[PDB]
């Protein structure tokens, strides 16, 4: 008296046109494949934009067994959406969450289990052009003249290989601490999701992960390698639709010895090729 | 089938001799000796170790001066179709008496008896019995002789015929002598 769903692919990723095939294992029963875009209302930023409501991507139900031992039964769905409705990338965000789930339920006089399968956006048409960016973290980067006076004199030079990043490829670059009067306690990368909901409109920025790249007083003139692996389901290609936007930024924050923090923001543009 | 045995005795190292005569070490090579019978007076574990590097079968009995006393006083070991009896020799009263050796072979009921207290080499047949006294390999002194020549005997046993090659160093020359024995 127990159910389980086994999706054929180990990685459980399926593209916008493939076929979702698997086996349901037991020890009448139906199975429903539902994809949802859950948008969570937030603190107002700008008529209260009361259009932030769940969006159903896909709805498909199969009556699998009409009303012992280890039993297995195959199943399959076609991943198709009319002619213009796109299957959004799986995205475990905070205010925008795009999730595809299979739900198997068996009636009794009802045992249910939900298993999530990932959907990957189709590769772009393809003219991938990296956009290398050079930057200089200086005391003239903090957006306050009042605090800037207490900042020790520092100068860091860096080069991001591309702000237009392939999501399967890591963010690579170099950072050279040309000269810092105060000892550098830590330099870390901070991937910040920028999620927007509604129209003329709630916009939030939330940290996904922090990855420290420089610990302690690094040699002055040594190229510390900026390396960052994008998280699997917490990052998606930059998505824009009339109801919601999901963008991504990276914040290089330098920490100095007397608890001083300096932020440089680079808006990335993730894509799949 | 040929069996090679090294009949030895009275090394007395180092109680009376520093080591074997220089040549006798050269004439003796490892991997070529099948048996090694010693009448005794090894006097050290070192001489026994030297013998152990010369063959695998090492039958050695107790002398009047052996450091290790676990040595059996009398030994009877069978090689080929023959049985050899081994004692040091100082048990016989008097030394080298043919009557005493005959009595000892009667007690042993053995084909051939080895008894080498008297360092002077002997080899004789009496009453269809074979008797070998190899003498001192290192030529250790004894009160019973004036000049002692180093000597050591080599059994060669084939079925029922034993040819004995005795190596004696006289002056600076290694004379070798042959004797023959056949079981009736």
């Amino acid at each position: 008296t127990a159910l389980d769903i086994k999706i054929k692919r180990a990685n459980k990723v399926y593209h916008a046109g493939e076929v979702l095939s698997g086996v349901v294992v037991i020890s009448g029963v139906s199975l429903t494949m539902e994809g949802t875009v859950n948008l969570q209302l937030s603190a107002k930023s700008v008529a209260f934009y009361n259009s932030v409501k769940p969006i159903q991507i896909i709805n498909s139900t199969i009556e699998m067994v009409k009303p012992s031992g280890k039993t297995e039964i195959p199943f399959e769905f076609p991943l198709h959406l009319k002619g213009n409705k796109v299957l959004y990338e799986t995205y475990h965000g905070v205010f925008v969450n795009i999730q595809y789930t299979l739900r198997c339920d068996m009636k009794r006089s009802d045992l249910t289990k939900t298993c999530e399968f990932i959907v990957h956006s189709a590769p772009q048409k393809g003219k991938f052009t990296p956009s290398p960016v050079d930057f200089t973290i200086t005391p003239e980067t903090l957006q306050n003249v009042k605090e800037r006076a207490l900042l020790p004199k520092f100068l860091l030079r860096g080069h991001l290989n591309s702000t237009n990043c392939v999501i399967t490829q890591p963010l690579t670059g170099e950072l050279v601490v040309e000269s810092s009067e105060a000892a550098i306690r830590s330099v870390e990368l901070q991937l910040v999701r920028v999620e927007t909901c509604g129209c003329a409109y709630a916009r939030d920025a939330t940290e996904i992960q922090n990855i420290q790249i420089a610990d302690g007083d690094v040699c002055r003139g040594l190229s510390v390698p900026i390396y960052m692996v994008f998280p699997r389901l917490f990052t998606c290609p930059t998505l824009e639709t009339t109801n919601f936007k999901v963008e991504f930024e990276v914040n290089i924050v330098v920490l100095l010895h007397p608890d001083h923090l300096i932020t440089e923001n680079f808006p990335l543009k993730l894509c799949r090729i | 089938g040929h069996r090679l045995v090294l009949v030895l005795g009275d090394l007395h190292i180092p109680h009376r001799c520093n080591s074997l005569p220089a040549k006798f070490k050269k004439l003796l090579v490892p991997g070529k000796i099948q048996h090694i019978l010693c009448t005794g007076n090894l006097c050290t574990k070192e001489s026994y170790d030297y013998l152990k590097t010369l063959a695998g079968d090492v039958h050695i009995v107790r002398g009047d001066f052996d450091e290790n006393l676990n040595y059996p006083e009398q030994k009877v070991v069978t090689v080929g179709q023959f049985k050899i009896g081994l004692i040091h020799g100082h048990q016989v009263i008097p030394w080298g008496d043919m009557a005493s050796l005959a009595l000892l072979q009667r007690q042993f009921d053995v084909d051939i008896l080895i008894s080498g207290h008297t360092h002077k080499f002997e080899a004789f047949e009496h009453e269809n019995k074979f008797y070998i006294n190899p003498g001192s390999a290192t030529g250790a002194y004894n009160a019973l002789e004036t000049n002692i020549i180093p000597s050591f005997v080599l059994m060669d046993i084939q079925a029922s015929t034993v040819v004995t090659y005795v190596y004696q160093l006289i002056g600076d020359d290694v004379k070798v002598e042959r004797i023959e024995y056949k079981k009736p």
Binding site: - | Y141, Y165, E180
Partner: protein, 802 residues
């Protein structure tokens, strides 16, 4: 029973008739006797030294996820508990807990609260990482059996989880731990991940943490992909880029805050640079080693770097470039890493590979000019132990003498010996290892004063055993150079004075073997008197050890017989006194012996060697003393530490004594059969065991002896001693007395046989009867009617009871 008649025996005629004809052999006649690899030192070994040396007594703190005031042993126990928790969590299918435990353990490596404990700490925590690295790998391998999609998915999940780690040092350590798993993602995964980790290490700002991280990365690379050396060279180059930070301002301030002096902060670095350089220089081409050498030279305070250059590079490279390394050592700053450590490393290199011939004298001179200026005795001996090997291997005895004198000069003042008993031993061993001929070793003037340095008892005696082993195994001919004798005499004295009541028997055996090895090799040529002088000073010198006395007795008897053989028996007036002195020497010497059966056997051998020189009176004294000693034999004796009966040994001793007294003449002032008569009295009076019948065996032996001696001519004779056969000339009275003794012995034997028959022990009675019949057949004249009847009766009695 019945009287005895002796069968006539003609020994010469019987031997001639029974002698087998022998055919000599000419030349040409056939007689049988005719004619990563093993060169890579693994991290497992270095584990022990790093853990042993780097120990701190300060209270440590292990903060996870808070614990304070922990000792080193408790710190190790807590790390072992963390490792066991890792293993249990993995075996319980809790992989996330395993990952978090490994992450925290790696986090511990980012803390430098106690600098002195960092190396050993690095060795402990890394073990957990290794335990992680294998334990993950097997799992994917367990899924493998270009692997299946499940194994690849698990491997990618692990790599993503590890790539999600925030702190840099934990991320690097955990990711490098599972570098092997990169095999399951692509054939180029390791070749694409190793350079990235090497570059990632640049983020570590603390020099010590970065250096040990580089060491771990090199270890993982060599135990995973040892064919990617081109990638790992970047570790050495980036390390040289970072080396400026070791002596920089930030680290100095950190040490000041922790209150740690630089002379103690620096020696924490070699454990990691040695590994880095060894991995990077393994089978490297000479061009790469050269380039590393000049890149190390061009820096500043590179005194530390040079050490690793000697500690890792092949011995040949450093040996050829040894003069340049001397030059580099010379300008090193004194306040930094010690210079004597660099000199020790260089000397260790020169102990394996020889330097160029033209430079050896300059190298030795410039090394000793710096070594002799050290003030601390301990590091001085650390250098000198290493460099004595070089001085003894390449140069002559004069330089060895100078080095030994310098060592003595340094260590004598402040009783420093106690701190360097082991090292000094090593030195002395080396001096003996390269000086085989002992006419040269003891020509070294300061060799004996060096032995005088070891004033402790246990330490000194071991060096003496080493000297004596070297002498016995490197001296194949007798020597006489008085320098040799006096020196070995002193060594044997100072080794024999260690024998006391507490000394074990095995120690006494080993010491006796060594002093015997010395004594055997002193041969005074034809100067027999001075050889006896050596023997008397030896007995006075080596009194305590019994086997030395035994060997001395044997050797003085050997000298007596050697004089006999040299003079061909014709004793001279001058040499009669010498042989009498030798035999009196032996007479004095035996009674001192402790063992009993040894005393008896040596008394006999002394007797026989005594009669060999026509000197009869003291020989009779020997036999009388032996007889008087006979009753002291115990029933139960000691053999090889165990306890064994003394029955058969007593039998063989008496048998030998009888066989000897065959030839011994009887003094005219006394009666016939004299010594035989007292021996008979003693054996009759001996407290023989009730269940023992070897006494009648000995009476049968008595019958054998008297029958043999009743013959006209004895079987064997002494060179110039008139035995009873020639003294009495077969007198009728002597034969009658012998026959009366025969009747007495036979009456005793028959009485014993009757007692055995009355005792109902028929097996022993039958054996006795058979043996007595065999004896009668041997010697008893069967022609006599009474003796033949007695033999027939004995045979019938033996056959009656089997």
């Amino acid at each position: 029973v019945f009287p005895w008649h002796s069968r006539n025996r003609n020994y010469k005629a019987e031997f001639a008739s029974c002698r087998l004809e022998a055919v000599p052999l000419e030349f040409g006649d056939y007689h049988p006797l005719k004619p990563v690899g093993s060169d890579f030192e693994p991290w497992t070994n270095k584990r022990g030294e790093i853990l042993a040396r780097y120990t701190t007594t300060e209270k440590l703190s292990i903060n996870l996820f808070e614990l304070l005031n922990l000792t080193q042993q408790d710190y190790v126990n807590r790390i072992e508990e963390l490792n066991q928790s890792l293993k249990d969590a993995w075996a319980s299918d809790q992989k996330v807990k395993a990952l978090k435990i490994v992450i925290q353990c790696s986090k511990l490596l980012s803390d430098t609260s106690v600098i002195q404990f960092y190396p050993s700490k690095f060795v402990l925590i890394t073990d957990i990482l290794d335990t992680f690295g294998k334990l993950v790998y097997e799992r994917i391998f367990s899924m493998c059996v270009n692997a299946n999609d499940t194994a690849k998915e698990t491997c990618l999940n692990w790599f993503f989880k590890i790539a999600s780690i925030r702190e840099l040092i934990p991320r690097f350590y955990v990711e490098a731990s599972i570098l092997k798993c990169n095999k399951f993602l692509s054939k180029t995964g390791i070749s694409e991940c190793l350079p990235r980790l090497t570059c990632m290490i640049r983020g570590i700002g603390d020099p010590l943490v970065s250096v040990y991280a580089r060491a771990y990365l090199c270890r993982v690379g060599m135990e995973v992909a040892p064919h990617l050396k081109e990638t790992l060279n970047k570790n050495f180059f980036d390390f040289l880029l970072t080396f400026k930070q070791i002596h920089g301002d930030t680290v100095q301030n950190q040490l000041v805050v922790q209150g740690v002096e630089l002379p103690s902060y620096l020696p924490l670095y070699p454990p990691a640079m040695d590994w880095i350089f060894q991995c990077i220089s393994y089978h490297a081409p000479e061009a790469l080693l050269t380039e590393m050498m000049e890149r190390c030279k061009k820096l500043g305070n590179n005194a530390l770097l040079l050490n690793s250059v000697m500690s890792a590079f092949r011995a040949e490279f450093i040996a050829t470039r040894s003069m340049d390394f001397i030059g580099m050592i010379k300008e090193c700053d004194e306040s930094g890493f010690p210079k004597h450590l660099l000199f020790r490393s260089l000397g260790l290199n020169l102990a394996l590979a020889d330097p160029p011939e033209s430079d050896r004298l300059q190298i030795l001179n410039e090394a000793w000019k710096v070594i002799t200026k050290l003030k601390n005795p301990q590091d001085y001996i650390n250098c000198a132990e290493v460099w004595v090997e070089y001085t003894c291997k390449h140069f002559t005895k004069r330089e060895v003498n100078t080095v030994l004198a310098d060592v003595i000069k340094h260590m004598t003042p402040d009783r420093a010996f106690e701190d360097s008993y082991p090292q000094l031993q090593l030195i002395i061993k080396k001096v003996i290892a390269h000086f085989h001929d002992f006419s040269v070793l003891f020509s070294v003037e300061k060799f004996l004063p060096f032995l005088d340095m070891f004033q402790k008892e246990s330490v000194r005696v071991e060096v003496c055993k080493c000297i004596m082993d070297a002498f016995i195994k490197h001296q194949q001919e007798p020597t006489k150079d008085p320098v040799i004798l006096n020196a070995l005499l002193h060594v044997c004295k100072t080794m024999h004075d260690s024998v006391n009541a507490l000394t074990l028997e095995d120690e006494k055996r080993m010491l006796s073997y060594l002093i015997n090895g010395f004594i055997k090799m002193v041969s005074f040529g034809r100067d027999f008197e001075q050889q006896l002088s050596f023997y008397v000073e030896s007995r006075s010198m080596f009194c305590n050890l019994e086997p030395v006395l035994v060997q001395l007795i044997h050797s003085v008897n050997r000298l007596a017989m050697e004089t006999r053989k040299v003079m061909k028996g014709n004793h001279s007036r001058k040499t009669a006194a010498f042989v009498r002195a030798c035999v009196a020497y032996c007479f004095i010497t035996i009674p001192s012996l402790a063992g009993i059966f040894t005393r008896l056997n040596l008394y006999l051998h002394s007797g026989q060697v005594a009669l060999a020189n026509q000197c009869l009176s003291q020989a009779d004294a020997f036999f009388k003393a032996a007889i008087s000693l006979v009753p002291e034999v115990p029933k139960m004796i000691n053999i090889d530490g165990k306890m064994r009966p003394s029955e058969s040994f007593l039998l063989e001793f008496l048998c030998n004594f009888f066989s000897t007294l065959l030839i011994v003449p009887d003094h005219p002032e006394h009666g016939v059969l004299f010594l035989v008569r007292e021996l008979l009295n003693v054996i009759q009076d001996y407290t023989w065991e009730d269940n023992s019948d070897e006494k009648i065996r000995i009476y049968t032996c008595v019958l054998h002896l008297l029958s043999a001696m009743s013959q006209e001519t004895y079987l064997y004779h002494i060179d110039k001693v008139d035995s009873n056969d020639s003294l009495y000339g077969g007198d009728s009275k002597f034969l009658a007395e012998n026959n009366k003794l025969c009747e007495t012995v036979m009456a005793q034997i028959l009485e014993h046989l009757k007692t055995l028959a009355k005792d109902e022990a028929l097996k022993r009675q039958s054996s006795l009867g058979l043996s007595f019949f065999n004896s009668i057949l041997a010697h008893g004249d069967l022609r006599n009617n009474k003796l033949n009847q007695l033999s027939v009766n004995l045979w019938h009695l033996a056959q009656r009871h089997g």
